[PDB]
Amino acid sequence: TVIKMAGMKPEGEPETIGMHLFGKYLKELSNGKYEVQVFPNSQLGKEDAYIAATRKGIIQMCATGTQTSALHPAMAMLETPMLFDNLDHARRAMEGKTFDLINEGFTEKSGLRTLNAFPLGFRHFYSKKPMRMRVPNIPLYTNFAKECGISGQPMPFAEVPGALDQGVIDGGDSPLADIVSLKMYEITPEISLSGHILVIHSLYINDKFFKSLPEQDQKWIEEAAKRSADDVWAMVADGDEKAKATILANKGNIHEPSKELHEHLVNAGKRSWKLFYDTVPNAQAILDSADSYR
Numbered sequence: 118t119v120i121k122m123a124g125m126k127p128e129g130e131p132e133t134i135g136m137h138l139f140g141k142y143l144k145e146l147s148n149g150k151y152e153v154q155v156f157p158n159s160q161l162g163k164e165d166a167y168i169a170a171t172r173k174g175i176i177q178m179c180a181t182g183t184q185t186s187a188l189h190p191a192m193a194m195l196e197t198p199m200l201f202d203n204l205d206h207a208r209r210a211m212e213g214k215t216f217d218l219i220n221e222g223f224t225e226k227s228g229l230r231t232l233n234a235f236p237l238g239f240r241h242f243y244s245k246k247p248m249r250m251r252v253p254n255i256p257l258y259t260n261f262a263k264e265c266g267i268s269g270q271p272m273p274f275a276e277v278p279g280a281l282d283q284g285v286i287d288g289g290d291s292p293l294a295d296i297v298s299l300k301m302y303e304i305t306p307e308i309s310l311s312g313h314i315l316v317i318h319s320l321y322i323n324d325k326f327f328k329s330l331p332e333q334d335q336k337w338i339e340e341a342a343k344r345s346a347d348d349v350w351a352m353v354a355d356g357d358e359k360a361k362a363t364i365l366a367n368k369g370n371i372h373e374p375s376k377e378l379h380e381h382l383v384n385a386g387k388r389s390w391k392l393f394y395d396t397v398p399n400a401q402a403i404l405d406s407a408d409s410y411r
């Protein structure tokens with residue numbers, strides 16, 4: 118049985134590594150019965166298209182992030198700005214009650230089942246000088262850019278390399294995995310560490326397709342998703358260290374916001390939670406659960 122999975126990231130990036138590991142593990146556990154074909158880097162379209170294709174069952178699985186907030190506002194809270202103190206905090210929440218609260222009701226709305234949660238990494242600024250900034254076209258990001266006084270230029274990730282090459286935008290903010298993967302520092306060499314948001318993605322599965330399988334097969338899929346997520350949680354920290362080094366080796370600079378700007382981002386981050394209180398019925402409970410794991 119072939120499972121087609123689409124994603125949005127290049128090879129060597131944690132989402133994509135995750136996808137392959139899931140594939141490797143699932144073949145293992147199911148004894149060669151299931152094979153997974155991985156289509157990363159928007160090969161089967163960008164997020165809106167491949168999410169829709171997965172909802173329809175045209176493909177069985179997809180890897181993405183808070184893009185699915187379009188279908189279920191609470192999903193945005195997977196990337197609540199300023200919510201987690203570090204990766205370990207976020208992992209406790211994401212393997213615990215916080216994820217459960219966020220995911221309640223999602224499948225009913227979407228036709229998708231969220232199988233795991235794993236990080237791509239904290240977002241840091243990249244720019245030509247230490248401003249037309251790229252932002253993802255997702256509400257939580259356009260809102261947050263505003264609160265930061267940033268002039269946001271919404272565009273899908275797939276368009277980022279051309280946008281950089283084209284030379285009108287001055288920067289953006291991304292996980293280090295993405296900054297290094299796209300060699301952003303060659304064009305926008307100045308990175309400022311902020312970590313205002315931790316990017317969290319998931320492997321999603323067409324729910325109809327999933328529930329059509331034997332309870333045993335469902336278990337192997339679930340175990341493969343868990344193992345794969347566990348691997349990614351364990352590799353991002355080490356990778357960000359090497360990424361930071363790499364930037365500093367290759368004419369890149371790393372900066373430290375100033376007290377004054379750090380404060381400006383935190384407040385911006387806290388203000389941006391109105392978006393969730395406005396849009397997510399159980400926002401306070403979700404926030405409370407995350408705080409319980411601190």
Ligand SMILES: O=P(O)(O)OC[C@H](O)CO
Pocket residue numbers: 181182183184196253255273274291316317318
């Ligand atoms: O990946 P980006 O840079 O488009 O940011 C959007 C995140 O993937 C949302 O989870």
